[PDB]
């Protein structure tokens, strides 16, 4: 039974999995990673310009 409630909570934590994608740390790294690939794209864009 205890394993049953543990499994039920684990299944219900898909909401937590979705919520952690809008965390300050996740958003921070995402913005930084976008900044780095956009810096590469801006270097290419400046060469093209």
């Amino acid at each position: 039974i205890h394993l049953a409630e543990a499994v039920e909570g684990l299944l219900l934590e898909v909401n937590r999995l979705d919520e952690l994608f809008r965390q300050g740390s996740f958003l921070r790294e995402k913005t930084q990673l976008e900044a780095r690939f956009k810096e590469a794209r801006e270097q290419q864009l400046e060469a093209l310009r």
Partner: protein
């Protein structure tokens, strides 16, 4: 307390938290923020249970 000692502003988004301040946050501060938020939403899951 740790954020204030470091000199950053703790902006809450609700269940989540984030740090507003100049430039990248220290790695230890980021790890502590992530662990605190993860524990908070784990406590929310335990509240559901």
């Amino acid at each position: 307390r740790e954020a204030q000692e470091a000199g950053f502003a703790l902006s809450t988004n609700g269940e989540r938290l984030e740090l507003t301040g100049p430039g990248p946050v220290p790695a230890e501060l980021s790890a502590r923020l992530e662990e605190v938020t993860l524990g908070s939403l784990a406590a929310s899951a335990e509240l559901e249970v």
